[PDB]
Amino acid sequence: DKGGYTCQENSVPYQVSLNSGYHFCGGSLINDQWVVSAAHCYKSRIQVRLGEHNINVLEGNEQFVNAAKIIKHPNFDRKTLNNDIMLIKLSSPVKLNARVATVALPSSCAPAGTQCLISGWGNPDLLQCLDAPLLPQADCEASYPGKITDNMVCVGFLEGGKDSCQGDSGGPVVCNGELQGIVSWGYGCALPDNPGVYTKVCNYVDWIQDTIAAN
Amino acid sequence: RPDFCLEPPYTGPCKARIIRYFYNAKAGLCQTFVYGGCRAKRNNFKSAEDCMRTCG
Ligand SMILES: [Ca+2]
């Protein structure tokens, strides 16, 4: 397994599941009509499921809403994964409550060493959680020679053992109440010297705000 | 048949969970595997029919 623990039910209210017949990616609710996820999670038709804990059972607090507009970063590179970020506008606003809430965009870039919370159904039935720190760029660079750009950040452990895995992409990395990362890629999962790589959200706050205001 | 049909399925570095088809030589047929969402190799098909047509 990926080393996480089952999150306390609805303790990560901003977490969403992207579904096109089955769960294939995660995402984060940033306001009542928009979700942020990874660009490699793009699909022409996407249904967003909010308020989920067990994605295989109808629990009663879920909200199912179709994506109305899917906007990938204009500079996304499918090969290098640079700028792996995408915005999804929902068909209608969701009802915000205790199980369905938004997460704040970063005020600034969090420094290495900051402890964060990574969540996803990745490894799917129950939402998994993982407490892990942002790693220094130098360490990230050493683990993935020539593959890390300034729009990426490594989060995890160089000894491996704990990590996000397939099914987690697009999901949140929240540190001190702010969305600092988006699950993107890695070589394997929980492998030593190959911690997960995440889209560094603080580099896109203006793009996000500008895009939402215009759409 | 083409060499890429005999290669093991390639999940890739991305962490999405997308079900794709790949031709399994040992089994002599196309089965499903989890693709990560990026950098697909050739033994990766959106459908069994395309998988069997190409690697049958
Ligand atoms: Ca459910």
mmCIF file of all heavy atoms in Angstrom, chain A residues 22-24 40 79 81 163-169 184-186, chain B residues 11-20 34-39:
data_model
loop_
_atom_site.group_PDB
_atom_site.id
_atom_site.type_symbol
_atom_site.label_atom_id
_atom_site.label_comp_id
_atom_site.label_asym_id
_atom_site.label_seq_id
_atom_site.Cartn_x
_atom_site.Cartn_y
_atom_site.Cartn_z
ATOM 1 N N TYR A 22 -16.108 5.943 -13.732
ATOM 2 C CA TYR A 22 -15.380 5.445 -12.570
ATOM 3 C C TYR A 22 -14.442 6.555 -12.105
ATOM 4 O O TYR A 22 -14.184 7.509 -12.836
ATOM 5 C CB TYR A 22 -14.582 4.179 -12.911
ATOM 6 C CG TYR A 22 -13.603 4.320 -14.063
ATOM 7 C CD1 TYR A 22 -12.319 4.836 -13.859
ATOM 8 C CD2 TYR A 22 -13.957 3.922 -15.355
ATOM 9 C CE1 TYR A 22 -11.416 4.957 -14.912
ATOM 10 C CE2 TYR A 22 -13.059 4.039 -16.415
ATOM 11 C CZ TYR A 22 -11.791 4.558 -16.184
ATOM 12 O OH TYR A 22 -10.900 4.689 -17.222
ATOM 13 N N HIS A 23 -13.952 6.443 -10.880
ATOM 14 C CA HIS A 23 -13.048 7.444 -10.342
ATOM 15 C C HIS A 23 -11.709 7.333 -11.067
ATOM 16 O O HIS A 23 -11.130 6.256 -11.119
ATOM 17 C CB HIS A 23 -12.840 7.215 -8.844
ATOM 18 C CG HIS A 23 -11.662 7.953 -8.285
ATOM 19 N ND1 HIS A 23 -11.759 9.236 -7.793
ATOM 20 C CD2 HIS A 23 -10.354 7.621 -8.213
ATOM 21 C CE1 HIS A 23 -10.560 9.659 -7.437
ATOM 22 N NE2 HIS A 23 -9.687 8.699 -7.682
ATOM 23 N N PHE A 24 -11.214 8.436 -11.623
ATOM 24 C CA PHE A 24 -9.935 8.403 -12.332
ATOM 25 C C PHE A 24 -8.945 9.485 -11.887
ATOM 26 O O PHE A 24 -7.761 9.399 -12.188
ATOM 27 C CB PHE A 24 -10.166 8.481 -13.856
ATOM 28 C CG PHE A 24 -10.666 9.813 -14.341
ATOM 29 C CD1 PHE A 24 -9.771 10.803 -14.734
ATOM 30 C CD2 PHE A 24 -12.031 10.085 -14.397
ATOM 31 C CE1 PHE A 24 -10.231 12.051 -15.177
ATOM 32 C CE2 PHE A 24 -12.500 11.322 -14.835
ATOM 33 C CZ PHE A 24 -11.600 12.310 -15.224
ATOM 34 N N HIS A 40 -3.276 16.594 -16.869
ATOM 35 C CA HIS A 40 -3.259 15.258 -17.459
ATOM 36 C C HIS A 40 -4.515 14.452 -17.108
ATOM 37 O O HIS A 40 -4.699 13.332 -17.585
ATOM 38 C CB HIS A 40 -1.960 14.499 -17.105
ATOM 39 C CG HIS A 40 -1.901 13.965 -15.703
ATOM 40 N ND1 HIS A 40 -1.225 14.618 -14.691
ATOM 41 C CD2 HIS A 40 -2.356 12.810 -15.168
ATOM 42 C CE1 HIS A 40 -1.273 13.887 -13.594
ATOM 43 N NE2 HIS A 40 -1.951 12.782 -13.852
ATOM 44 N N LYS A 79 4.491 15.818 -22.194
ATOM 45 C CA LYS A 79 5.681 14.997 -22.067
ATOM 46 C C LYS A 79 6.475 15.305 -20.791
ATOM 47 O O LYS A 79 6.818 14.399 -20.038
ATOM 48 C CB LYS A 79 6.559 15.195 -23.303
ATOM 49 C CG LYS A 79 7.867 14.447 -23.258
ATOM 50 C CD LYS A 79 8.396 14.156 -24.655
ATOM 51 C CE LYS A 79 9.684 13.340 -24.584
ATOM 52 N NZ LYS A 79 10.293 13.098 -25.928
ATOM 53 N N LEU A 81 5.342 17.461 -18.387
ATOM 54 C CA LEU A 81 4.359 17.699 -17.334
ATOM 55 C C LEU A 81 4.491 19.076 -16.687
ATOM 56 O O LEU A 81 3.951 19.319 -15.611
ATOM 57 C CB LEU A 81 4.445 16.604 -16.270
ATOM 58 C CG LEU A 81 4.040 15.269 -16.884
ATOM 59 C CD1 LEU A 81 4.537 14.128 -16.030
ATOM 60 C CD2 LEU A 81 2.522 15.244 -17.035
ATOM 61 N N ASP A 163 3.643 7.762 -0.026
ATOM 62 C CA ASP A 163 3.546 8.526 -1.259
ATOM 63 C C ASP A 163 2.116 8.517 -1.812
ATOM 64 O O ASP A 163 1.252 7.779 -1.337
ATOM 65 C CB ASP A 163 4.480 7.868 -2.267
ATOM 66 C CG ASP A 163 5.013 8.825 -3.327
ATOM 67 O OD1 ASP A 163 4.532 9.976 -3.474
ATOM 68 O OD2 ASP A 163 5.945 8.389 -4.033
ATOM 69 N N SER A 164 1.872 9.376 -2.799
ATOM 70 C CA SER A 164 0.594 9.414 -3.481
ATOM 71 C C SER A 164 0.830 8.406 -4.603
ATOM 72 O O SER A 164 1.974 8.111 -4.923
ATOM 73 C CB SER A 164 0.334 10.815 -4.043
ATOM 74 O OG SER A 164 1.467 11.293 -4.754
ATOM 75 N N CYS A 165 -0.230 7.872 -5.190
ATOM 76 C CA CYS A 165 -0.076 6.890 -6.254
ATOM 77 C C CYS A 165 -1.210 7.041 -7.282
ATOM 78 O O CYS A 165 -2.033 7.956 -7.179
ATOM 79 C CB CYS A 165 -0.077 5.477 -5.655
ATOM 80 S SG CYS A 165 0.789 4.197 -6.624
ATOM 81 N N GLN A 166 -1.257 6.155 -8.278
ATOM 82 C CA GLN A 166 -2.292 6.235 -9.304
ATOM 83 C C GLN A 166 -3.683 6.284 -8.681
ATOM 84 O O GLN A 166 -4.037 5.451 -7.835
ATOM 85 C CB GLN A 166 -2.168 5.058 -10.283
ATOM 86 C CG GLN A 166 -1.092 5.272 -11.337
ATOM 87 C CD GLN A 166 0.299 5.127 -10.752
ATOM 88 O OE1 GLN A 166 0.543 4.223 -9.961
ATOM 89 N NE2 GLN A 166 1.211 6.015 -11.133
ATOM 90 N N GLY A 167 -4.454 7.280 -9.116
ATOM 91 C CA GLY A 167 -5.799 7.497 -8.621
ATOM 92 C C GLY A 167 -5.820 8.771 -7.792
ATOM 93 O O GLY A 167 -6.888 9.299 -7.463
ATOM 94 N N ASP A 168 -4.628 9.275 -7.472
ATOM 95 C CA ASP A 168 -4.486 10.484 -6.661
ATOM 96 C C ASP A 168 -4.299 11.766 -7.466
ATOM 97 O O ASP A 168 -4.519 12.855 -6.944
ATOM 98 C CB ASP A 168 -3.294 10.342 -5.720
ATOM 99 C CG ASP A 168 -3.584 9.441 -4.541
ATOM 100 O OD1 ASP A 168 -4.765 9.328 -4.144
ATOM 101 O OD2 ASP A 168 -2.625 8.838 -4.009
ATOM 102 N N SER A 169 -3.877 11.633 -8.724
ATOM 103 C CA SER A 169 -3.617 12.793 -9.593
ATOM 104 C C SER A 169 -4.706 13.868 -9.529
ATOM 105 O O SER A 169 -5.904 13.581 -9.502
ATOM 106 C CB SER A 169 -3.471 12.362 -11.052
ATOM 107 O OG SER A 169 -2.146 12.047 -11.360
ATOM 108 N N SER A 184 0.749 15.201 -9.223
ATOM 109 C CA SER A 184 1.060 15.132 -10.648
ATOM 110 C C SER A 184 1.733 13.833 -11.111
ATOM 111 O O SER A 184 1.102 13.016 -11.773
ATOM 112 C CB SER A 184 1.938 16.336 -11.029
ATOM 113 O OG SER A 184 2.119 16.443 -12.435
ATOM 114 N N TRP A 185 3.004 13.635 -10.763
ATOM 115 C CA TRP A 185 3.715 12.436 -11.197
ATOM 116 C C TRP A 185 4.821 11.962 -10.259
ATOM 117 O O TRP A 185 5.106 12.575 -9.231
ATOM 118 C CB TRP A 185 4.315 12.671 -12.591
ATOM 119 C CG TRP A 185 5.354 13.767 -12.644
ATOM 120 C CD1 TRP A 185 5.124 15.114 -12.686
ATOM 121 C CD2 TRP A 185 6.780 13.608 -12.676
ATOM 122 N NE1 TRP A 185 6.310 15.800 -12.753
ATOM 123 C CE2 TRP A 185 7.343 14.900 -12.746
ATOM 124 C CE3 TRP A 185 7.634 12.494 -12.668
ATOM 125 C CZ2 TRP A 185 8.728 15.114 -12.801
ATOM 126 C CZ3 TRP A 185 9.010 12.708 -12.713
ATOM 127 C CH2 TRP A 185 9.541 14.008 -12.785
ATOM 128 N N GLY A 186 5.445 10.858 -10.643
ATOM 129 C CA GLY A 186 6.539 10.304 -9.877
ATOM 130 C C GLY A 186 6.960 9.018 -10.552
ATOM 131 O O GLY A 186 6.221 8.505 -11.386
ATOM 132 N N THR B 11 2.351 1.685 -17.062
ATOM 133 C CA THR B 11 1.528 2.619 -16.303
ATOM 134 C C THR B 11 1.978 4.072 -16.499
ATOM 135 O O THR B 11 1.153 4.968 -16.638
ATOM 136 C CB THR B 11 1.542 2.248 -14.797
ATOM 137 O OG1 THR B 11 0.765 1.058 -14.597
ATOM 138 C CG2 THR B 11 0.953 3.370 -13.952
ATOM 139 N N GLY B 12 3.286 4.305 -16.516
ATOM 140 C CA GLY B 12 3.781 5.658 -16.701
ATOM 141 C C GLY B 12 3.947 6.369 -15.368
ATOM 142 O O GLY B 12 3.506 5.857 -14.341
ATOM 143 N N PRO B 13 4.539 7.570 -15.356
ATOM 144 C CA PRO B 13 4.762 8.329 -14.125
ATOM 145 C C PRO B 13 3.582 9.117 -13.569
ATOM 146 O O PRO B 13 3.573 9.480 -12.400
ATOM 147 C CB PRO B 13 5.909 9.249 -14.505
ATOM 148 C CG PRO B 13 5.643 9.553 -15.943
ATOM 149 C CD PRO B 13 5.035 8.301 -16.536
ATOM 150 N N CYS B 14 2.588 9.390 -14.400
ATOM 151 C CA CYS B 14 1.452 10.160 -13.922
ATOM 152 C C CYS B 14 0.581 9.317 -13.004
ATOM 153 O O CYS B 14 0.548 8.086 -13.104
ATOM 154 C CB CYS B 14 0.660 10.717 -15.101
ATOM 155 S SG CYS B 14 1.579 12.072 -15.894
ATOM 156 N N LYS B 15 -0.133 9.984 -12.106
ATOM 157 C CA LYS B 15 -0.934 9.264 -11.129
ATOM 158 C C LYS B 15 -2.450 9.267 -11.272
ATOM 159 O O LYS B 15 -3.179 9.291 -10.277
ATOM 160 C CB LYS B 15 -0.514 9.726 -9.734
ATOM 161 C CG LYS B 15 0.970 9.446 -9.492
ATOM 162 C CD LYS B 15 1.470 10.007 -8.176
ATOM 163 C CE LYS B 15 2.831 9.410 -7.818
ATOM 164 N NZ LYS B 15 3.460 10.113 -6.662
ATOM 165 N N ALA B 16 -2.930 9.233 -12.510
ATOM 166 C CA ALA B 16 -4.366 9.170 -12.749
ATOM 167 C C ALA B 16 -4.659 7.674 -12.721
ATOM 168 O O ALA B 16 -3.740 6.866 -12.605
ATOM 169 C CB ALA B 16 -4.710 9.743 -14.113
ATOM 170 N N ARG B 17 -5.926 7.304 -12.818
ATOM 171 C CA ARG B 17 -6.281 5.903 -12.821
ATOM 172 C C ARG B 17 -7.210 5.718 -14.008
ATOM 173 O O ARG B 17 -8.430 5.847 -13.899
ATOM 174 C CB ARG B 17 -6.962 5.560 -11.513
ATOM 175 C CG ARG B 17 -7.410 4.118 -11.430
ATOM 176 C CD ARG B 17 -8.635 4.046 -10.575
ATOM 177 N NE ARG B 17 -9.310 2.757 -10.714
ATOM 178 C CZ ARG B 17 -10.609 2.561 -10.519
ATOM 179 N NH1 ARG B 17 -11.340 3.622 -10.175
ATOM 180 N NH2 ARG B 17 -11.150 1.382 -10.610
ATOM 181 N N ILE B 18 -6.598 5.427 -15.148
ATOM 182 C CA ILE B 18 -7.317 5.258 -16.395
ATOM 183 C C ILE B 18 -7.176 3.819 -16.879
ATOM 184 O O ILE B 18 -6.067 3.318 -17.053
ATOM 185 C CB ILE B 18 -6.759 6.249 -17.438
ATOM 186 C CG1 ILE B 18 -7.058 7.682 -16.974
ATOM 187 C CG2 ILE B 18 -7.380 6.002 -18.798
ATOM 188 C CD1 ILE B 18 -6.048 8.715 -17.423
ATOM 189 N N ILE B 19 -8.307 3.152 -17.085
ATOM 190 C CA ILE B 19 -8.287 1.768 -17.532
ATOM 191 C C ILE B 19 -8.097 1.696 -19.044
ATOM 192 O O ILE B 19 -8.878 2.260 -19.819
ATOM 193 C CB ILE B 19 -9.591 1.034 -17.151
ATOM 194 C CG1 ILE B 19 -9.892 1.241 -15.661
ATOM 195 C CG2 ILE B 19 -9.451 -0.464 -17.437
ATOM 196 C CD1 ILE B 19 -8.756 0.827 -14.720
ATOM 197 N N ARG B 20 -7.037 1.012 -19.454
ATOM 198 C CA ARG B 20 -6.732 0.861 -20.866
ATOM 199 C C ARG B 20 -6.539 -0.611 -21.156
ATOM 200 O O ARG B 20 -6.509 -1.431 -20.241
ATOM 201 C CB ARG B 20 -5.453 1.625 -21.210
ATOM 202 C CG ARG B 20 -5.615 3.121 -21.174
ATOM 203 C CD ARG B 20 -6.484 3.604 -22.322
ATOM 204 N NE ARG B 20 -6.660 5.052 -22.283
ATOM 205 C CZ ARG B 20 -5.724 5.925 -22.648
ATOM 206 N NH1 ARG B 20 -4.544 5.500 -23.084
ATOM 207 N NH2 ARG B 20 -5.962 7.230 -22.574
ATOM 208 N N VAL B 34 -3.978 -0.425 -15.493
ATOM 209 C CA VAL B 34 -4.142 0.956 -15.091
ATOM 210 C C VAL B 34 -3.049 1.837 -15.676
ATOM 211 O O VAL B 34 -1.865 1.643 -15.411
ATOM 212 C CB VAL B 34 -4.135 1.092 -13.558
ATOM 213 C CG1 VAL B 34 -4.112 2.562 -13.171
ATOM 214 C CG2 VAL B 34 -5.363 0.403 -12.967
ATOM 215 N N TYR B 35 -3.473 2.798 -16.486
ATOM 216 C CA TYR B 35 -2.578 3.750 -17.124
ATOM 217 C C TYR B 35 -2.608 5.036 -16.286
ATOM 218 O O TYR B 35 -3.678 5.477 -15.849
ATOM 219 C CB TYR B 35 -3.062 3.998 -18.552
ATOM 220 C CG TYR B 35 -2.370 5.118 -19.287
ATOM 221 C CD1 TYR B 35 -0.977 5.170 -19.386
ATOM 222 C CD2 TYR B 35 -3.112 6.117 -19.905
ATOM 223 C CE1 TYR B 35 -0.345 6.192 -20.086
ATOM 224 C CE2 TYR B 35 -2.494 7.146 -20.606
ATOM 225 C CZ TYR B 35 -1.111 7.179 -20.696
ATOM 226 O OH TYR B 35 -0.503 8.194 -21.393
ATOM 227 N N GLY B 36 -1.433 5.624 -16.067
ATOM 228 C CA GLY B 36 -1.331 6.827 -15.257
ATOM 229 C C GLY B 36 -1.786 8.142 -15.865
ATOM 230 O O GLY B 36 -1.936 9.127 -15.151
ATOM 231 N N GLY B 37 -1.984 8.187 -17.179
ATOM 232 C CA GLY B 37 -2.435 9.422 -17.794
ATOM 233 C C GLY B 37 -1.433 10.155 -18.663
ATOM 234 O O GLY B 37 -1.786 11.161 -19.282
ATOM 235 N N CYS B 38 -0.189 9.688 -18.714
ATOM 236 C CA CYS B 38 0.804 10.338 -19.557
ATOM 237 C C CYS B 38 1.908 9.393 -19.999
ATOM 238 O O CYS B 38 2.172 8.371 -19.356
ATOM 239 C CB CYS B 38 1.418 11.551 -18.848
ATOM 240 S SG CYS B 38 2.519 11.181 -17.456
ATOM 241 N N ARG B 39 2.536 9.745 -21.117
ATOM 242 C CA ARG B 39 3.639 8.978 -21.690
ATOM 243 C C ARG B 39 3.341 7.519 -22.024
ATOM 244 O O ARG B 39 4.154 6.634 -21.757
ATOM 245 C CB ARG B 39 4.850 9.053 -20.762
ATOM 246 C CG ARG B 39 5.415 10.455 -20.631
ATOM 247 C CD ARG B 39 6.625 10.431 -19.733
ATOM 248 N NE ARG B 39 7.590 11.480 -20.044
ATOM 249 C CZ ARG B 39 8.706 11.289 -20.741
ATOM 250 N NH1 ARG B 39 9.007 10.078 -21.190
ATOM 251 N NH2 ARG B 39 9.541 12.303 -20.952
#
